[PDB]
Amino acid sequence: LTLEIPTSPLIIKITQQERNILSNVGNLLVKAFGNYENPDYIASLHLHAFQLLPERITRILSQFGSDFSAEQYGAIVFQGLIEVDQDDLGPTPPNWQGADYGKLNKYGFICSLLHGAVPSKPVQYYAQRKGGGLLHAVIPDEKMAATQTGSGSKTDLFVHTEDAFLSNQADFLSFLYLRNEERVPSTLYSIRSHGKMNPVMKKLFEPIYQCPKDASGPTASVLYGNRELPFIRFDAAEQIFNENAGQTSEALGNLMDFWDEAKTLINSDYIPNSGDLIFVNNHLCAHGRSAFIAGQRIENGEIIKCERRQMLRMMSKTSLIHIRSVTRTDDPYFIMEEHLGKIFDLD
């Protein structure tokens, strides 16, 4: 049997009945636990995930969690997972700090159940907004328009796996789109799109690459895990297109050769709609976002002003045990890692 190389993510069209189930379950959890960060909820998360999710989602996510095969892209698009009432959501705040988590509470429950069904445990990183909770609102901030962050817009967000500078980077990611009126394409890149292991990829197993943290450094491997069907930690903007990356001549050459091959495999075909969720295996699939002017789209050579882009990000880890040396004593879900093993030294 010849291998069918994955070039695009799996598309799941969520039904109205599934959407109704998710909504009621979300409301029931809100009443039962108050919020998705409730320790009683988090402790029994997987029980809630398998008992409350529409069964087809549970089967999809369970299959996905343990699938690192040649055929696995490492991303799923859940089309119309939720119905977003745009007027109730109201205008997009100036930045992420102004997000109404009282209004997003139900969405946090829904997202945590999806991670719970992998099974995987939502976590937070001190490296990202000093934790900032299990659910992050990703909003274009006008002050950060030209930055290579989630608060950016005007510049292309090059494909990257989340937190390539951390040894304990997220295992799984979820991106829930509340609004994408600018019609910004989601860009995804899978290491599986390369097919069979080749000489360009083999050089990436060498632990000779700089993985710069954003805010002499240790080096890591870009490819790891299985030698034939590997996992990836990669950030094009931070490791390649950064004068201060400090890469060796050999490492930069290897990364350049890899990027030349990888850029032809980037998939920007999917334009998320309000209510879509993209679920990612952060060890298989990198993500990015094309450049856009927040609060507008162009149709028929005319500018259509619109509400600014709003997406919700949640990250999870399949094992609390393996990350225990980098988590808070009183919170095994709070990762204090700063850079490839080094922990933040706070006073």
160 carries a ligand binding annotation: yes
* Cβ 43 to Cl ion shortest distance, Å: 28
Residue 150 is a binding residue for Cl ion (CB under 5 A):
yes
Answer with the entry of Cl ion, Re ion, none that 122 interacts with (C-beta below 5 to 8 A by kind). Answer: none
Q: How far is CA 1 from CA 4, 10, 68, in A?
A: 9, 21, 18
Check if the beta carbon of residue 74 is closer than 8 Å to that of residue 192.
yes
Residue 140 is a binding residue for Cl ion (CB under 5 A):
no
Torsion of CA 119, 165, 78, 295, to 10 degrees: 140
Check if the beta carbon of residue 187 is closer than 8 Å to that of residue 261.
no
Residue 262 three-state SS: helix
The smaller minimum CB distance to Cl ion, of residues 30 and 145, is found at 145
CA–CA distance, 112 with 135 (Å, rounded to integer): 9
Query: Which tokens is 261 given?
Result: 């091959």
* Cβ 149 to Cl ion shortest distance, Å: 8
The smaller minimum CB distance to Re ion, of residues 53 and 166, is found at 166
Span from 17-25, 147-155, 195-203, 258-266 in contact with Cl ion (CB under 5 A) = 147-155
Span from 27-35, 143-151, 163-171, 197-205 in contact with Cl ion (CB under 5 A) = 143-151
Q: Per-residue x/- mask for Re ion, residues 196 to 235, rule CB under 5 A?
A: ----------------------------------------
* Cβ 148 to Re ion shortest distance, Å: 10
Task: Enumerate residues 113-132 that contact Cl ion by CB under 5 A.
Answer: none
The smaller minimum CB distance to Cl ion, of residues 122 and 150, is found at 150
The smaller minimum CB distance to Re ion, of residues 162 and 337, is found at 162
Check if the beta carbon of residue 104 is closer than 8 Å to that of residue 179.
no
Residue 54 is a binding residue for Cl ion (CB under 5 A):
no
* Cβ 287 to Re ion shortest distance, Å: 6
Residue 188 three-state SS: strand
Q: SS3 for 210-240, per residue?
A: ECCCCCCCCEECCEEECCCCEEECCEHHHHH
37 carries a ligand binding annotation: no
Helices in 152-273 by DSSP H: which ranges? 199-202, 249-262
Tell me the torsion sign for CA atoms 41, 46, 51, 54. positive
339 carries a ligand binding annotation: no
* Cβ 177 to Cl ion shortest distance, Å: 12
Find all residues with CB under 8 Å of 92, minimum gap 6, and list them: 139, 179, 307, 308, 309, 310
Torsion of CA 165, 68, 61, 286, to 10 degrees: 40
**Side chain identity, residue 165:** F
Span from 128-136, 157-165, 212-220, 262-270 in contact with Re ion (CB under 5 A) = 157-165
Answer with the entry of Re ion, Cl ion, none that 163 interacts with (C-beta below 5 to 8 A by kind). Answer: none
Q: Per-residue x/- mask for Re ion, residues 162 to 191, rule CB under 5 A?
A: x-----------------------------
Answer with the entry of Cl ion, Re ion, none that 181 interacts with (C-beta below 5 to 8 A by kind). Answer: none
Contact positions vs Re ion (CB under 5 A):
162
Contact positions vs Cl ion (CB under 5 A):
150
Binding site for Fe cation, by residue number, is 160, 162, 287
Binding site, by residue number, is 160, 162, 287
